[PDB]
Amino acid sequence: ACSDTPIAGLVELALSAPTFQQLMQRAGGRPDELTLIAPASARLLVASALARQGPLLVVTATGREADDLAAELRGVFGDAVALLPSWETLPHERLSPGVDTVGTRLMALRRLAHPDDAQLGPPLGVVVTSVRSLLQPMTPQLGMMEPLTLTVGDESPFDGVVARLVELAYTRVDMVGRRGEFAVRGGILDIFAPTAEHPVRVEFWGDEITEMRMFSVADQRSIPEIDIHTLVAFACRELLSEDVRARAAQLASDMLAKLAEGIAVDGMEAVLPVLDGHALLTDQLPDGTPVLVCDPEKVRTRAADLIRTGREFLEASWSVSGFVELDQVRAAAARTGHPWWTLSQLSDESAIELDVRAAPSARGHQRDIDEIFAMLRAHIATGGYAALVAPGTGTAHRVVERLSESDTPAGMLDPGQAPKPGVVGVLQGPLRDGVIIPGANLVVITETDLTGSRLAAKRRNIVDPLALTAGDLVVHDQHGIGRFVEMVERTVGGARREYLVLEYASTDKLYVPMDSLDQLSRYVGGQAPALSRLGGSDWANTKTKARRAVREIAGELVSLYAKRQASPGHAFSPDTPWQAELEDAFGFTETVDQLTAIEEVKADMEKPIPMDRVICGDVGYGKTEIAVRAAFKAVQDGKQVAVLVPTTLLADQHLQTFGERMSGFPVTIKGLSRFTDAAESRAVIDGLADGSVDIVIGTHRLLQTGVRWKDLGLVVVDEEQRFGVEHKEHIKSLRTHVDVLTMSATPIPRTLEMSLAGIREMSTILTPPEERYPVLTYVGPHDDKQIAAALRRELLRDGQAFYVHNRVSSIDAAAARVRELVPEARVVVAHGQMPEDLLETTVQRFWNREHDILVCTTIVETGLDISNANTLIVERADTFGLSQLHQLRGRVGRSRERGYAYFLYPPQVPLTETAYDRLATIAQNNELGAGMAVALKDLEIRGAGNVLGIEQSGHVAGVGFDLYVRLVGEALETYRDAYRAEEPKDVRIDLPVDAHLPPDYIASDRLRLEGYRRLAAASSDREVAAVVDELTDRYGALPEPARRLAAVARLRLLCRGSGITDVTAATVRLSPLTLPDSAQVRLKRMYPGAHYRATTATVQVPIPRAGGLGAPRIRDVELVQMVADLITALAGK
């Protein structure tokens, strides 16, 4: 059928087998009891047998066991089956669960009560969830809870719409950062529904909606690709009318107290039982629908585990139950008209055994696959039906190439059709493990049955709100270092003019206007105060003695461009036909903003010129995956590659990632780490020479002397910063003759990416925020239960955890202190003072699941990417700068597994409220906003710095980082334009005009400075008239006070384009721009009253009065276009 149900063709065939027919026949009368004993590898069509007959809810053991099944049902039943997301936090945990998890659940519950009302989607047929939602004492008023539907033609009032948003647990913010937020512009509304991949911008005209259009949180700009006209945004919590406020104060203290008030606080979810009506899920299911149960011996145990965690968390909350029993919840199934069906793979003669059996499973060794391809190569001979299922179309086509290579007929199938009678009609599908049904002579083998073991990047165009906290420190170009105090307004003459005040050392104040924000930036160099430059004539010396200092970095960085352009090299052939068969192992839809990272890195390879490209990203994987795509093209042209890493752990992480991905393609991928014994070295090195090792991945061992590649074609270096000094040069002597591919994690500002775009082509990738699942942050006193009670949670799903402790004198002692809390777990110490041999050993055990908890220091937590350690705990978070935390919890929640983060402070020693501003900031609007974003802007130190040369600590403290990397930029631009075979000064304008960003247009302060900056830095009207295209997209049509602000901006450009410094005034006078008698008299008829001086020009001009005798003045608008005309007339335009 429709391509969205690809696997339905294969399943409808298997279901035709009689073993399901009777199973469908027996489960056709809705028997109040049932018992089936079939292999667990076939949970999908067991439901797909009961599903279309009886619309049912299925229960999986874990959440992952629900998702893997929920896709196996969506692939056949399209969107008729919806996943019911299990929760994340325990009912009495102080962490509100994920907003997406809440809404995605609310969406499901309203589909139940209104399946025929397809206001959002088709009627639900099947539901999937773990037990943890089945035991949820849900307040039943959800399917009867109305969301806030909107439509373009609506008449909904402004202040009423927000009044329901704020009632639906929506957090007002400056700018929309995450799901569950919203902001109000002037008559324009920005909200973020939790069930959408993108937020929206519903535009109002009084009480009539003018427009609805999504927008990308990255740059907060809209997108025109998809136009929508209606929205549905369920609440973010499972509870807050005026009814419960009384039920809060009448009964942690501030929580219910603020709950009684209009102050919603985190952790409200722990007050659901107090605020009856324990309507279980069977009391929310539609009338007369059964419940399928998988692995009872698991869910039973799983039920107990969820139960004990409850009391384990309640008694943890008593530091200043949970789910109902399974049998009682079961007692309502046959009490509310709901059968109870059992599934199990354990042998049984009492129940109904199904004739379906398991399927083979090869792990890596192709020899076993020959014993599987032959099984395919024989069952089809007896007219048998068979088709290999795979997740990726590119891989599915490889199977056709791989089966025919093994002397076996094959062929890709149309999505939604059964396998052909005789051929292997390979079909893309999300099935996990193969299954064989003799009831139709049918055999299906998923690609996982060979791998045994089983998400893209994005480009950059972002914003920068000038968050300036009082007492901060900034660099002013023409003046020098400063100390920031406050943002002053001044209504002098009816017209506003906002300013910024800076404090100096001594002629002590300085109001920087809004036409000079491009000349300000933070200070990062000294990491400590320096001489606050006084307004005088010594700071300029510090500048002039710095421009000369950049020559070494000027000549060197521009030299590599000369050498690379001189030395030609192998231009790689275009994309091998095999390329678009590895790149499509995932059924996901590619993003035309992730392609541009490869086509950038590809075309650079495709030139005869070598490649000098750099990737600076935080994702860790999405850029790592880019390597395998490039390294695949290279060896396809017959040119072995080399991959460099600074940690032997990284050599193994990548090698497994490479091997798993490059499994099924003939490319040798041997590796060279420290723990690869020398008996394996001599096989690698020699294998490198004879052209057998197609791909080598190794530590600094690959740099030492006695190595040689047979015409190495591609070098990939990962996180150059960790590499040693003398190793950092042996790669500098390597970028000249081979297409190196540098990749780092230091975040680079958007200056370098364009400041040096001809020299070193750098690129910055970042996982788009609307696609990252945030980490549930907690901030509380240092309790020895809440830690341990949290530890066992992550430990339940066989995950690990980071327990950081900086002060190296206690970490050894504070290590065992953990074990007394959790002795059942495994803990290890790790820090920088550990020698080389011990550290990469202790860490390598960690990645191989020989341990459960890592007592690391702030360093080792960073630079360690673990696909399972989704739990962070931080003792004494009061001693940590705001930035490090953002790096710290970045390591948790990278994969699909949602991650937590526990920040702790001493028990009864009250922390400074300044530090309270720290730990509150990390709790509220974390990923971006006012506070934390100001930190990662200061992250330009390593970003702008360590990406090029290093921090010359003596030549920065006094100029600051931002001014350093900005200085070599034009210094390189001087060297760029130099070989071909001083810019004008600043202009000051003071006109009686209303040119300001009014607060009623831009409510916030920082969001107002960016527009002031983003417009005062534009270099051409094309750029000036461009920010307007952004402002109306974000805040609405420019009011007349702003149109003048745009007007004077162009007037500056025309003035600068004509050599003008001061245009001052009823006597409009301009700069010393001199005039010849040719035009010096041309002004007569043009403007009579004026006059001019040949030496000190200062062209004086009178103001025009319209009308007759009443003597007004020409309107503000009519003025600027006049001044923008006489300038054009003088020079001639």
Coordinates of C-alpha atoms in Angstrom, one line a residue, residues 661-877:
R661 CA 29.2 0.3 9.7
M662 CA 31.7 -1.0 7.1
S663 CA 30.5 -4.6 7.7
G664 CA 29.6 -6.1 4.3
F665 CA 32.1 -4.2 2.2
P666 CA 35.5 -5.6 1.3
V667 CA 37.7 -3.1 3.2
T668 CA 40.3 -4.3 5.8
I669 CA 40.0 -2.1 8.9
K670 CA 42.7 -3.4 11.2
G671 CA 43.7 -1.1 14.1
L672 CA 46.8 -0.2 16.1
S673 CA 46.4 0.6 19.7
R674 CA 48.6 0.3 22.8
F675 CA 47.1 -3.0 23.9
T676 CA 47.6 -4.5 20.4
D677 CA 50.6 -6.7 21.2
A678 CA 53.7 -6.2 19.1
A679 CA 52.9 -9.6 17.5
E680 CA 49.9 -7.7 16.1
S681 CA 52.0 -4.7 15.2
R682 CA 54.3 -6.4 12.7
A683 CA 51.1 -7.8 11.0
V684 CA 49.6 -4.3 10.8
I685 CA 52.7 -2.3 9.7
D686 CA 53.7 -5.0 7.0
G687 CA 50.0 -5.1 6.1
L688 CA 50.1 -1.3 5.7
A689 CA 53.0 -1.6 3.2
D690 CA 51.6 -4.4 0.9
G691 CA 48.4 -2.5 0.3
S692 CA 46.3 -5.0 2.3
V693 CA 45.2 -2.7 5.2
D694 CA 42.6 -0.6 3.5
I695 CA 42.0 1.4 6.7
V696 CA 44.1 1.8 9.8
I697 CA 42.9 3.4 13.0
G698 CA 45.6 4.1 15.6
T699 CA 47.1 6.2 18.4
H700 CA 50.3 8.1 18.2
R701 CA 52.0 4.8 17.4
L702 CA 51.2 5.5 13.8
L703 CA 53.5 8.6 14.0
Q704 CA 56.7 6.8 15.1
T705 CA 59.5 6.1 12.7
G706 CA 59.3 2.6 11.3
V707 CA 55.9 3.0 9.5
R708 CA 55.1 3.4 5.9
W709 CA 51.9 3.5 3.8
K710 CA 51.6 2.4 0.2
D711 CA 50.6 5.8 -1.2
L712 CA 48.4 7.0 1.7
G713 CA 45.5 9.0 0.4
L714 CA 43.5 10.4 3.4
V715 CA 44.4 11.4 7.0
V716 CA 41.7 12.0 9.6
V717 CA 42.8 13.5 12.9
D718 CA 40.3 13.5 15.8
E719 CA 40.5 16.3 18.5
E720 CA 44.0 17.6 17.7
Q721 CA 44.1 19.5 21.0
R722 CA 44.8 16.4 23.1
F723 CA 47.7 15.5 20.9
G724 CA 51.2 16.1 22.3
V725 CA 53.5 18.9 21.2
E726 CA 56.0 17.0 19.0
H727 CA 53.1 15.0 17.5
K728 CA 51.3 18.3 16.7
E729 CA 54.1 19.1 14.3
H730 CA 54.4 15.7 12.7
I731 CA 50.9 16.3 11.5
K732 CA 51.8 19.9 10.5
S733 CA 54.4 18.3 8.2
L734 CA 51.5 16.1 6.9
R735 CA 48.9 18.6 5.6
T736 CA 51.0 19.5 2.6
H737 CA 50.9 16.2 0.5
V738 CA 47.8 14.3 1.6
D739 CA 44.1 15.3 2.0
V740 CA 44.1 15.6 5.8
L741 CA 40.7 15.8 7.5
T742 CA 41.0 17.7 10.8
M743 CA 38.2 17.3 13.3
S744 CA 37.9 18.8 16.7
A745 CA 35.5 19.5 19.5
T746 CA 36.5 23.1 20.4
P747 CA 33.5 25.3 19.4
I748 CA 34.5 28.0 16.8
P749 CA 32.7 31.4 16.3
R750 CA 31.2 32.3 13.0
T751 CA 34.1 34.7 12.4
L752 CA 36.8 32.2 11.6
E753 CA 34.5 30.1 9.4
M754 CA 34.4 33.1 7.1
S755 CA 37.4 35.2 8.3
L756 CA 39.6 32.5 6.8
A757 CA 37.5 30.8 4.1
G758 CA 40.2 30.8 1.4
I759 CA 43.1 29.7 3.6
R760 CA 41.9 27.0 5.9
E761 CA 38.3 26.0 5.1
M762 CA 36.7 25.4 8.5
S763 CA 33.2 24.1 9.3
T764 CA 31.2 24.0 12.5
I765 CA 28.5 21.3 12.9
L766 CA 26.0 21.1 15.8
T767 CA 23.1 18.8 16.5
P768 CA 20.0 21.1 16.0
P769 CA 18.5 21.8 19.4
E770 CA 14.9 20.6 18.6
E771 CA 16.4 17.2 17.9
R772 CA 18.4 16.8 21.2
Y773 CA 16.6 15.4 24.3
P774 CA 17.6 17.5 27.3
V775 CA 19.0 16.0 30.5
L776 CA 16.8 16.1 33.7
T777 CA 18.9 18.4 35.9
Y778 CA 18.5 18.2 39.7
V779 CA 19.9 20.7 42.3
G780 CA 19.6 19.7 46.0
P781 CA 21.5 19.1 49.2
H782 CA 24.1 16.4 49.5
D783 CA 22.0 13.5 50.6
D784 CA 23.6 10.0 50.8
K785 CA 20.2 8.3 49.9
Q786 CA 19.1 10.4 46.9
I787 CA 22.5 9.7 45.4
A788 CA 22.3 5.9 46.0
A789 CA 18.6 5.8 45.2
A790 CA 19.4 7.5 41.9
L791 CA 22.5 5.3 41.2
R792 CA 20.4 2.1 41.3
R793 CA 18.0 3.5 38.8
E794 CA 20.6 3.9 36.0
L795 CA 22.1 0.6 37.3
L796 CA 18.8 -1.2 36.6
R797 CA 19.1 -0.7 32.8
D798 CA 22.7 -1.9 32.9
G799 CA 24.0 1.7 32.5
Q800 CA 27.0 3.4 34.1
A801 CA 27.3 6.7 35.9
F802 CA 29.8 9.5 36.3
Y803 CA 30.5 10.5 40.0
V804 CA 32.8 13.5 39.6
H805 CA 35.1 14.7 42.5
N806 CA 37.7 17.4 41.8
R807 CA 39.9 17.7 44.8
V808 CA 42.3 14.8 44.3
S809 CA 43.1 14.3 48.0
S810 CA 39.6 13.0 48.8
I811 CA 38.6 11.2 45.6
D812 CA 40.3 7.9 46.8
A813 CA 38.5 8.2 50.1
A814 CA 35.3 9.6 48.6
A815 CA 35.4 6.6 46.3
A816 CA 34.7 3.9 48.9
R817 CA 32.2 6.3 50.5
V818 CA 30.1 5.5 47.4
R819 CA 30.5 1.7 47.9
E820 CA 29.0 1.9 51.4
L821 CA 26.0 3.5 49.7
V822 CA 25.9 1.1 46.7
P823 CA 28.0 -2.0 47.4
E824 CA 26.2 -4.0 44.7
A825 CA 27.8 -1.8 42.1
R826 CA 31.3 -1.5 40.7
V827 CA 33.3 1.8 41.2
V828 CA 36.6 3.0 39.9
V829 CA 38.9 6.1 40.4
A830 CA 40.3 8.1 37.5
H831 CA 42.0 11.5 37.3
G832 CA 44.7 13.4 35.5
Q833 CA 47.5 12.6 38.0
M834 CA 47.1 9.0 37.1
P835 CA 50.0 7.8 34.8
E836 CA 49.5 7.1 31.1
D837 CA 49.5 3.3 31.6
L838 CA 46.8 3.4 34.3
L839 CA 44.4 6.0 32.9
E840 CA 43.7 4.5 29.4
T841 CA 43.5 1.2 31.2
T842 CA 41.0 2.2 33.9
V843 CA 39.0 4.0 31.2
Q844 CA 39.2 1.0 28.8
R845 CA 37.7 -1.3 31.5
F846 CA 34.9 1.3 31.9
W847 CA 33.9 1.2 28.3
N848 CA 34.0 -2.6 28.4
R849 CA 31.5 -2.8 31.3
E850 CA 33.9 -4.1 33.9
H851 CA 32.6 -1.3 36.2
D852 CA 29.5 0.7 36.9
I853 CA 30.5 4.0 38.5
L854 CA 33.5 6.3 37.6
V855 CA 34.9 8.6 40.2
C856 CA 36.5 10.9 37.7
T857 CA 37.6 14.6 37.9
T858 CA 36.2 17.4 35.8
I859 CA 38.8 16.7 33.1
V860 CA 38.2 12.9 32.6
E861 CA 34.4 13.5 32.5
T862 CA 35.1 15.6 29.5
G863 CA 36.8 14.0 26.5
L864 CA 35.1 10.7 27.4
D865 CA 32.1 9.8 25.2
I866 CA 30.3 6.7 26.5
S867 CA 27.2 5.5 24.7
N868 CA 25.7 4.2 28.0
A869 CA 26.9 6.4 30.9
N870 CA 23.7 8.5 31.1
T871 CA 23.9 9.6 34.8
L872 CA 26.0 12.4 36.2
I873 CA 26.5 13.3 39.9
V874 CA 28.6 16.3 41.0
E875 CA 29.7 16.7 44.6
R876 CA 30.2 20.3 45.7
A877 CA 28.8 21.9 42.5

